[PDB]
């Protein structure tokens, strides 16, 4: 009895505590599994698996137990299969993907453990069950049984089941299993495909509507899994499907149409023609069908047939499009999101084959429609088609209808819709140069919506400017872009940051277009307005404001004072280390522009004075800033100033220039090659110095110099620096020794493993353990780093009495 309590203790140490406790306890259960026995152990495990309280990760760990005990127990599980299975089976039907895959995993392991004959003998009485739910799970159980074991192994059982004359429920479940096998396995079906089709094939012909339905769904699932291969396997079922298509009705026909839709993409171009035409006689009739399930199918079959290579673009243009537009492109279809997405997709695929203009010309008449949701549907379709195919196909007379309708739809939607914003931006960007005649109408429509009283509605108008200002450049740009910008300049006082971010995102788009002299709110008025906005808490505002101040610095440096730029740099300074990636990247780019704007000298003098007087947070920000002023502008303008700060006889400023140099070398990368010789003597002083933090961060400079200059020569200067790094190998402070290991791992790359080995050899067998520990730690980094390179560099070691240590193959001559 007490050993069952040990199972509790072991379960507890898996379900709770540190990972080695879990690992040990699992090892204990699994090796003890033979003694515990399957009966007691599953009487105890299955209650946890049945508990509603069990988390996903608890369940996953319990599965990681179940796999191993099943492997250990093996044949011992055979009496308990029935009990184990009924607790597990519901997982196969759980909506949670992970609960589901876990159930499949443990049925797989249970099926490897228990003999096939026992799985069959367990689940066979459920094949014949009256409940479709029991049959459904049983079908999913057997599919997993098939997956774990060989598919051929289960075939002789399926061959008996699908011909089980005494119960349609049984024959039905057989074909459910054959469907579920295809859904589970995927393309792995293919070498067993004809064996599976030849099990189903008689079912399509059967006297029971249920069996015909499930066999058509099995054939759909097999065809889906086989795509694009395996057509030769289905040659059996082609005749039965047409003979059914011509005859069946309702959801029993929807099943056959589903099968056919998956078969036509498998076919050669000649058969694709013949059999698509066979479909349309019935599929066009089903376009009238009231049933939403049928309507889901026929759109799928249209998408599949017209997507197939064989079927003529002209055939689609003549026989598909007229009845399709008639029955589906009408107001009633916008009402259901399922039909909505399916119709949009189907229609975009027709466009991919037949062309943009053939579809768009049947749709655009309804951009001017009454209903918002139907206008949304057509707009989403035009959005997708012109995103895929562009404007090339579209007639001038179709532009006129597009743009008229697009403008009408935008002025019509009561509430800001993303779809209308997408559609309008896409179509304008696609048309490009062709938009020129309509620009007054577009601008007026935008400007109207930009003067609207609603926050969201103005956000959408500014977003639309943001997405399309590049097209608006075309002509009278100064006139139109400029007034849009003056309206936006008023909204720079926005109460809502969501909106202000878009105002800024629209202003940003204007200055990326306008020549800065032609700006309508002059830059002298624009920048002061932005300076308080830089301090806004909201991410979208900060991003667009910093990025906009960026373009003003880049493109229009001359319009504002040195001191104006200097104050802006000093405010931007902390944003270089902001939490958000976007805010940092904007700050880095734009500090780089403003450093060019000011010129490097006084911005650097200001940064070096800040580096002496601030808290660690803002001091690290200045090290980032100084490096931007080096990569941008000139590095040679930065290093002379840093060299002078190091001549100040104070440990805190000196330590500061070492952090500045360490980041400068990380940041400028390959540019560092020009500068190693100049910075070398500073690093000698720093690395000879008594201070622990000088030697730590001089080592960090050497890491970044080394990794930055790899392959550009300079190994002379790096060998020289290694003579000052290397003595620090016996330092004991965590921070200095990790920085020294970092430097050595850098120099292994830039000087190479040969040199690093030459520094290790005399210490690997040195008398003192504290030398050996340190030298083997270094050697192991070089070895893991460069194992195959070391072959060339190992010294000649002479033979002993017992042992051969020469490498004779490398002594050979040719």
């Amino acid at each position: 009895e007490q050993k069952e309590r040990k199972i509790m203790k072991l379960l507890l140490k898996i379900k709770n505590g540190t990972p080695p406790m879990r690992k040990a306890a699992l090892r204990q259960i699994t090796d003890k599994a033979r003694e515990f026995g399957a009966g007691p152990l599953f009487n105890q495990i299955l209650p946890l698996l049945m508990s509603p309280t069990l988390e996903d990760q608890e369940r996953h760990l319990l599965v990681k137990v179940i796999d191993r005990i099943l492997y250990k127990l093996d044949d011992l599980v055979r009496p308990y299969v029935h009990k184990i299975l009924v607790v597990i089976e519901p997982l196969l039907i759980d909506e949670d993907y992970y609960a589901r895959v876990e159930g499949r995993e443990i049925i797989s392991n249970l099926a490897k453990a228990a003999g096939l004959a026992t799985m069959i003998s367990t689940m066979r009485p459920d094949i014949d069950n009256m409940d479709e739910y029991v049959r459904n799970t049983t079908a999913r159980a057997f599919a997993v049984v098939a997956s774990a074991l060989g598919i051929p192994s289960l075939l002789p059982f399926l061959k008996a089941v699908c011909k089980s004359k005494k119960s349609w429920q049984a024959r039905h479940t057989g074909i459910k299993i054959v469907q579920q096998i295809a859904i589970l396995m995927g393309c792995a079906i293919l070498p067993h495909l004809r064996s599976l089709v030849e099990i189903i094939e008689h079912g399509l012909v059967d006297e029971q509507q249920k069996v015909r339905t499930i066999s058509a769904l099995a054939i759909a699932a097999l065809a889906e899994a086989a795509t694009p291969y395996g057509i030769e396997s289905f040659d059996s079922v082609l005749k039965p499907l047409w003979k059914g298509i011509r005859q069946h009705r309702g959801k029993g026909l929807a099943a056959f149409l589903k099968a056919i839709g998956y078969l036509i993409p498998l076919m050669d171009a000649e058969y694709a023609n013949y059999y698509t035409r066979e479909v349309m006689l019935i599929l066009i009739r089903e376009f009238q069908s009231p049933d939403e399930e049928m309507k889901k199918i026929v759109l799928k079959v249209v998408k599949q047939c017209c997507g197939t290579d064989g079927v003529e673009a002209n055939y689609i243009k003549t026989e598909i499009l007229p009845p399709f537009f008639k029955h589906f492109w009408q107001h009633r279809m916008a009402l259901d999101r399922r039909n909505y997405r399916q119709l949009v997709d189907t229609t975009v695929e027709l466009a991919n084959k037949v062309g943009a203009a053939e579809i768009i010309s049947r749709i655009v008449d309804d951009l001017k429609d009454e209903a918002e949701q139907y206008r949304k549907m057509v707009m989403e379709t035009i959005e997708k088609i012109m995103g895929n195919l562009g404007a090339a196909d579209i007639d001038h007379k179709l532009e006129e209808q597009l743009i008229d309708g697009i403008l009408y739809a935008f002025q019509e939607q009561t509430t800001e819709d993303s779809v209308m914003l997408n559609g309008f931006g896409t179509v304008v960007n696609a048309l490009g140069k062709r938009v020129k005649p309509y620009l007054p109408q577009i601008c007026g429509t935008v400007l109207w919506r930009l003067n609207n009283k609603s926050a969201k509605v103005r956000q959408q108008a500014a977003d639309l400017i943001s997405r399309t200002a590049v097209v608006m450049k075309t002509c009278q740009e100064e006139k139109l872009m400029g007034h849009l910008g003056v309206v936006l300049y008023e909204y720079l006082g926005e109460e809502y940051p969501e909106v202000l971010g878009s105002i800024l995102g629209a202003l940003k788009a204007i200055v990326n277009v306008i020549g800065m002299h032609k700006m309508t709110p002059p830059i002298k008025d624009l920048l002061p307005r932005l300076t308080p906005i830089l301090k806004n808490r909201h991410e979208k505002v900060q991003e667009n404001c910093i990025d906009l101040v960026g373009r003003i610095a880049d493109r229009g440096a001359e319009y504002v004072s040195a001191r104006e730029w200097m104050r802006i740099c000093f405010e931007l300074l902390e944003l270089l280390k902001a939490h958000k990636k976007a805010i940092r990247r904007a700050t880095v780019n734009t500090f780089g522009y403003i450093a060019k704007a000011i010129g490097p000298h006084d911005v650097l003098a200001t940064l070096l004075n800040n580096l002496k007087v601030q808290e660690r947070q803002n001091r690290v920000c200045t090290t980032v800033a100084i490096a931007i002023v080096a990569e941008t502008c000139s590095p040679f303008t930065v290093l002379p100033a840093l060299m002078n700060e190091y001549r100040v006889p104070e440990l805190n400023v000196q330590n500061g220039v070492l952090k500045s140099l360490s980041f400068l070398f990380e940041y400028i990368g390959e540019m560092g090659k020009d500068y190693i010789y100049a910075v070398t003597p500073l690093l000698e002083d720093a690395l000879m110095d008594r201070d622990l933090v000088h030697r730590q961060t001089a080592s960090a400079v050497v890491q970044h110099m080394s990794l930055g200059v790899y392959g550009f020569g300079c190994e002379d200067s790096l060998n020289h620096l290694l003579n000052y790094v290397w003595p620090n190998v016996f330092e004991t402070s965590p921070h200095v020794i990790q920085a020294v290991m970092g430097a050595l791992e850098g120099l292994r790359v830039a000087i190479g493993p040969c040199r690093m080995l030459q520094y290790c050899l005399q210490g690997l067998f040195h008398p003192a353990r504290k030398v050996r520990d340190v030298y083997w730690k270094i050697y192991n980094s070089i070895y893991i780093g460069s194992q195959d390179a070391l072959i060339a560099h190992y010294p000649r070691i002479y033979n002993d009495d017992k042992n051969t240590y020469i490498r004779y193959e490398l002594d050979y001559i040719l």
Binding site: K368, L407, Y408, Q441, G444, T445, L447, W448
Partner: peptide, 18 residues
Amino acid sequence: EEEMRKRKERVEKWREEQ
């Protein structure tokens, strides 16, 4: 002011075309 004049023209111009 063109802004509302052209707005009213757009909406009426469709419902005349309808």
